[PDB]
Design a protein around this ligand. Structure first.
Ligand code: ZN
Ligand code: ZN
Ligand code: ZN
Ligand code: ZN
Lengths: 88, 88
């Protein structure tokens, strides 16, 4: 998941688009509205079945709180496309 | 903008642009019911005139809005990258 020579600066953006639970690019990104943290749907829903809190900041969170953060899905798709188009 | 080598990055630029002011998000707010995003001031001003999402027309009021803090970080990071890749 690396860029052509001289695009090391892209790492910051790549890192922002990765879930803190699984380290993969957001898959069906969900926001926790009370704290603005984001996770893959499956990742966060699995965590909340365990503990009803944000796995980053510890604020109380229940499953009905979660909302889709659709723009992150769009960004993941577009960044993957960009990266592959450049490596070509 | 991006040099020709990196023209594809315009796709990422486009996703970080507020649909009200056409500038990169400043203090991004998400409308949770529809997942569209706008600069905080842009959408709050719009809602004082018409209580709807500018893109999808669902009813929205100011108490609905939540910070989408990841977008501000993405804007900051992409600005850095762009400003250091002008001669790529
Ligand atoms: Zn995940
Ligand atoms: Zn949190
Ligand atoms: Zn705006
Ligand atoms: Zn909308």
């Amino acid at each position: 998941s690396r860029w052509p020579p001289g695009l090391a600066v892209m790492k910051t953006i790549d890192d922002l688009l990765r879930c803190g639970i699984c380290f993969e690019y957001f898959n069906i990104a969900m926001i926790i509205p009370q704290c603005s943290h984001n996770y893959c749907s499956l990742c966060i829903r699995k965590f909340l079945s365990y503990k009803t809190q944000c796995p980053t900041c510890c604020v109380t969170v229940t499953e009905p709180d979660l909302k889709n953060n659709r723009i992150l899905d769009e960004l993941v798709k577009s960044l993957n496309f960009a990266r592959n188009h450049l490596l070509q």
